[PDB]
Design a protein around this nucleic acid. Structure first.
Lengths: 105, 255
RNA sequence: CCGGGCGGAAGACAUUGUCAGGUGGGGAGUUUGGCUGGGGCGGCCAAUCUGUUAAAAGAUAACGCAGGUGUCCUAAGAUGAGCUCAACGAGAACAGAAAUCUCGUGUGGAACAAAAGGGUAAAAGCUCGUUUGAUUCUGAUUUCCAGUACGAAUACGAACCGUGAAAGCGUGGCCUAUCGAUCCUUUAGACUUCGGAGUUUGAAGCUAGAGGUGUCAGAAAAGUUACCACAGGGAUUACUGGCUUGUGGCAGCCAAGCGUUCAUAGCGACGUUGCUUUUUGAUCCUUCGAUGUCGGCUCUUCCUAUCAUUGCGAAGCAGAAUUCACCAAGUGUUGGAUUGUUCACCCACCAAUAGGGAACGUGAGCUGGGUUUAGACCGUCGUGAGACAGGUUAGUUUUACCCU
RNA sequence: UGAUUUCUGCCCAGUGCUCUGAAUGUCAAAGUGAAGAAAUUCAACCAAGCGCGGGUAAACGGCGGGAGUAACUAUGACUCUCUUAAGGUAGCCAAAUGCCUCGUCAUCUAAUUAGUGACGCGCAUGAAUGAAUGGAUUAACGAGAUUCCCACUGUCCCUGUC
RNA sequence: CAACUAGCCCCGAAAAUGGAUGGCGCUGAAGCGCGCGACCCACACCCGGCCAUCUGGGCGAGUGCCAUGCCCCGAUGAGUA
RNA sequence: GUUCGUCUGACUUGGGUAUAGGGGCGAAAGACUAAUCGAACCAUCUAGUAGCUGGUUCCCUCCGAAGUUUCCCUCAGGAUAGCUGGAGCCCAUUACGAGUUCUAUCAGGUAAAGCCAAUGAUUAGAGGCAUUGGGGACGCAACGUCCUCGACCUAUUCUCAAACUUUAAAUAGGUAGGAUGGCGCGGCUGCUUCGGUGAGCCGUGCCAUGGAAUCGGGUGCUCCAAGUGGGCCAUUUUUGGUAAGCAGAACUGGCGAUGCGGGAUGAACCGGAAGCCGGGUUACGGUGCCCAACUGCGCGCUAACCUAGAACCCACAAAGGGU
RNA sequence: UGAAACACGGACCAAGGAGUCUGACAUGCGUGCGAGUCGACGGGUUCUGAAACCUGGGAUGCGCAAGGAAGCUGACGAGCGGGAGGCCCUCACGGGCCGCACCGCUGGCCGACCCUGAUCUUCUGUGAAGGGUUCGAGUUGGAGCACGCCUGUCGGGACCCG
RNA sequence: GCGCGACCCCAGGUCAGGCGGGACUACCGCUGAGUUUAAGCAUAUAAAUAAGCGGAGGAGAAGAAACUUACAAGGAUUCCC
RNA sequence: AAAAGACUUCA
RNA sequence: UCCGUGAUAGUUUAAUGGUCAGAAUGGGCGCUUGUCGCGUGCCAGAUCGGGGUUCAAUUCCCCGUCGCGGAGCCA
């Protein structure tokens, strides 16, 4: 969507900093398994391998529009707080720089 | 989906079955006591009886000798050139003349035979349809194996103990010249297990047959279906290596 | 003679059983939007935005108008300071119509991401400088509105920051569009619980975010049916009638021209006013728990905008053909060839072979050839089933005796 | 697919199918090894299938468009250029297949939207989706479809009588 | 004498089952325009009588008892779902 | 019934026998399988379901709707709000309330106007003006001159706008016109003020008909439930469409929920909402007769053989012609 | 929307024939008793399916709020304006006093949520104390419970029929 | 071979006796739908119900804890609240 | 060895 | 007609991502050649008209003209 710096200052919510300080933006996502989840429900009520409520596949739940998907992670306590709603599509990052405008050549 | 298709109807039932009872009797080969150096089991051809059940003859060979446990009688497969009152010899050390049945080992290489056993005592497996014959291709002094080139052209490893009959089977040329009636075709199929007229898949309804339906006449999809495909699915030319009209050959194994 | 391994083949392979992956319309169950001038085809008026329609508060629709929305941006955000633009004139090596430079004039005629419309000038623009509030919490408030959720907006509080001399201003983009339930997962909070007690993994909770449903307040869904079925519908089609008369047909007004001459014997441009339902649509008013389609065969009545004939008025009517107008439906207005076609188009007669209506007159009067069922062939379209305003063939015509 | 006679061309890109092919890729369970006290987690192996390669149209089916070029003229044998899996060949054709269409025309009849034979850039023909059947007035078989001739007759002129 | 203004009448103005200012008929109208009186005339309006409903009163102190009774008011009353 | 296909074979036909319901059988018509076949019949599950059609049963009284808002695989229907009734609940001419006017004060960009006001369209000239749009003539040349045709510019001129407007109505629309108010006294605060400075909110005192007009055969308030959820029409305003008894809005009244009287006749127009009656009196519309009622009075016009004329809506009608 | 309808049903008549009944619910109304209330599972008993008697209760309420653990643990206790009515004064008009029902509003207190954290203390407990644009079906001076009937609501064949 | 007893395995129209089917209200097992509901429909609902099948009795099943609990512990089984 | 084709009249 | 789809050198048709357009053949010019041809070196655009957005449009939109196909019921 937009190159937005990987280095920003932002507030810490946690009470050992509780002020603006440097934070390095990086995404962390994982996913599930431990069986204690949806997967136990699927095992019981499949009931001959019938998929049931595991399929929302047709009628697109796939669009190319997201929101912010950012977590800006503290280099002063490493606890960090999430940021509120704004629009993305993709999201550009790389180790940033600026995306500096005004071109001479 | 659809109503069940005509092949599955084989199953059981008198309607799909033939009159097997009308057929004239066993085609069996009398299981050698031992020996047979000319006439230790001596058969006499007394008739050559037509078999309606394959529309080709089996020679009636009558063995008659007593004891009580003697087992005898009935129809060995006819070969060419056989006559009534000629003696038939069945066993190990039998003389090499047409119509005699003996183990394949004692028959020399390059020799035309009719009937072979696909393991001893099953009485006749390879070449039994008219004007066809196997030719025993190789032996050597091989205890284990006699190799036979079949009328399919396949070279088959089969035990040297297995019996075969000298000559080719009789009634040859049967299928070669044309019927020239629908009615002649009917009579042959009636006597054997077949239902006579072939209705095309296109002519059938879409419910009955996959190829059916459509305003104009056509088979809707590709005829060729997989061998791995299940019963019901498996239609048309099953697992065809090629189609369209040119340059195949007989079954051609190499060794 | 001796050997209880019937005798061979095959041999720990096959087989059989159970899990496991694949395959599987063969068979199973099920489904295959809505709005809608019938419904399909088509379109999105499906969730939304701008100006207008909208009849000067407000509300305010149509498949109303002209368009737009699933984006774009670390600045095009935030804040301060500096500067002033669109354009034109006059000048300035090269340089012309446009180069770059200068001054004057210059209310915005520009620029502010985008659609459109507002707004805005020592700015919100344009340039520079410093920046990160495009932040943390949890309410209220405004819109849509049930005075709901949700989104988005407003302005505060409580935090912490930023900028700038500071006062101040800042909860993203100058304003109006740019977005999303419960489940489930994911992430954060080191809190709670895992229940006979602990410890530790793991798990489950609560609070606030993310992964999303575009039929956008949020089912889990592809076709065909002329082989069809059933509940209903004239809320609704194809058909008659009715309103309408664009489209069609018929008849006027004006008169520039044509007609040797001469606008008007006969015609008549560019226009323009009527009438009719003899074209066809538009409509859905009436009928779908039932008004028998089209043509022909037959027979009637009526209509006149009269083709002929009766009797007349014009004439570029010499004779005569012929052409125009009047009263007039009294009386005629045809046979065949072909096509289901009425219509059409020929042949040929003739005084004349006018045009229209009557439930698109006319099926318990007929015929059943067309349209329009079930069989079927061909072509095209379709993976297929099937479809065809494409062709082709064969295909049940019931009941009057009641009342007028 | 539909007797015979005769001929059946082009294309495996697509949809299917096939294979002593793929060489170990993707890849399941059981099983195996490692870590963790373990639950569990991860790795490699992983068949068939899939991906990959070859074969295949009497399997389904498909089987091009623009231009220019003949000394009247028109048309294009001729030739280009693009493009595809391949560009409809042999044949048949206004045909039970042609919208326009009652096509233009030789046709029978006074008159024929019907029938025939040509032409056919053929809306939308075509080779077992089977095409054709040795000029033809091109025979056979059919309660078939269609057309024309002759006999015949109340089908009609024009109705009547029993 | 000419050009106009606008009344009625005439033309323009032709359809089918025969036909409709509704009809007959009407010409100093019974037509058309207009004035003036008189008059006619809806379940409307008024006055009176009367019904219920609603409203406000009133009358039980017992020992005629409806006291949810009885009596005085005035206004109101269509009516589908 | 007539006419007719076949009639020595793939012939005809009987009996016995086999195959049964997602099954059979089929020289294949979705044909047929005991008057039954695109899945037989029977009983059961089953008293199955159906937003849809039909019907839905005694009376009188009083009040009395709506086809609209919002959401919906929703547009033949529900939820939702509104309308409507009931049960009341609280006071009562105290009180405040009002489809209302006035007054006074706001807001508005429609009708219209405007265009020589901006923007957009658009007609016509006229008169200027060039260091560089094009021609010609006069010139060796010019920082030359004259005609010419263009641009532009200026003052004019013409005609228009839903998506133009400086301007700009009317009818509509909002607010206020007091005791739910004002004023005096003096208290508190973490607010606000560099300051008791101020703000708000408390106790206490003073001032009535008195805050335009008018009305309230009373009003205010709360709970709960039915029906409605297809509307239709006319005047006026208005969008699409040639138009339409058309489709779709805006306002209002009706019909629906409406007879009676009038328009001959007519669901919606006109008049008026209707207890039951007598008597009076009218409306609409009439008064020649039908048909109740002046063939009354007054003053004009009309003579219609190519349709005399004769009551809104409404049953049509025009350009154009007449000594 | 409109039925005389060229909409649909009905020849005529008799007799059948369709909002019921229940369980669990809301409101209304009535009845009882009332910080309780509800006998009837049961037991006693009997004139015998009854009626009479009686038990501990259990259920519901009397306090709540959280997802849960739980909660100093919910007792300090409230004002204001309009208020019927009464009281007082006044001949009355009015004035003053007390003020209910009820309504509106501003606080305090409790839980959940967030801050504040004294003295103390088995070593992290404790919760005096001062607050908060958060939130609750609370306290701030309760009302229920049982029974019944109409109507509404849901499951039931469920107004009747398809 | 002959194996006393017997070992192992057969046969009696065998000696005395016993089983099938019914009933199937109710009961004890087995096995097993869909309509319906979700206004659609598959997971789910209907329902561990109807259908199908077997077997007893006047009752049947159950039955003296490899239980419930977390307590100064309850205490086979059944049914009601 | 494969790159080698045309070419007016009287003549 | 409705919904789609193009157009670029003389001709036939490639290409771009916004600053930029090609090839082949024909033709025009030499050379090959007795002489032409094959062959061999050389050369040559309104990217349809049309506005808009935009620094800058052949390229990204919108409209229109033309040329095409494919749909258009109960007919």
């Amino acid at each position: 969507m937009v190159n937005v710096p990987k280095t920003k200052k932002t507030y810490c919510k946690n009470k050992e900093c509780r002020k603006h300080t440097l934070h390095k933006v990086t995404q962390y996502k994982k996913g599930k398994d431990s069986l204690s989840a949806q997967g136990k429900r699927r095992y019981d009520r499949k009931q001959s391998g019938y998929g049931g409520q595991t399929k929302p596949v047709f009628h697109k739940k796939a669009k190319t529009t997201k929101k912010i998907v950012l977590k800006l992670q503290c280099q002063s306590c490493k606890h960090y707080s999430q940021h509120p709603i704004k629009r993305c599509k993709h999201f550009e990052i790389g180790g940033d720089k600026k995306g500096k405008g005004t071109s001479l050549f | 989906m659809g109503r069940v298709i005509r092949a599955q109807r084989k199953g059981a039932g008198s309607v799909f079955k033939s009159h097997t009872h009308h057929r004239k009797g066993p085609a069996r080969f009398r299981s050698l006591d031992f020996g047979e150096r000319n006439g230790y089991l001596k058969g006499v051809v007394t008739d050559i009886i037509h078999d309606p059940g394959r529309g080709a003859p089996l020679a009636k060979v009558t063995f008659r000798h007593p004891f009580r446990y003697k087992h005898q009688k009935e129809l060995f497969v006819a070969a060419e050139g056989m006559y009534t009152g000629q003696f038939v010899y069945c066993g190990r050390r039998a003389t090499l003349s047409i119509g005699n049945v003996l183990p394949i080992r004692s028959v020399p290489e390059g020799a035309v035979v009719c009937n072979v056993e696909h393991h001893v005592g099953d009485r006749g497996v390879f070449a039994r349809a008219s004007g066809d014959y196997a030719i025993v291709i190789s032996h050597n002094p091989d205890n284990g194996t006699s190799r036979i080139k079949l009328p399919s052209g396949a070279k088959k490893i089969v035990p040297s103990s297995c019996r075969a009959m000298i000559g080719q089977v009789a009634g040859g040329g049967r299928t070669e010249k044309p019927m020239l009636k629908a009615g002649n075709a009917y009579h042959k199929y009636r006597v054997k297990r077949n239902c006579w007229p072939k209705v095309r898949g296109v002519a059938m309804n879409p419910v009955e047959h996959p190829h059916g339906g459509g305003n104009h006449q056509h088979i809707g999809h590709a005829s060729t279906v997989r061998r791995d495909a299940p019963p019901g699915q498996k239609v048309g030319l099953i697992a065809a290596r090629r189609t369209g009209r040119l340059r195949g050959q007989a079954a051609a194994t190499a060794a």
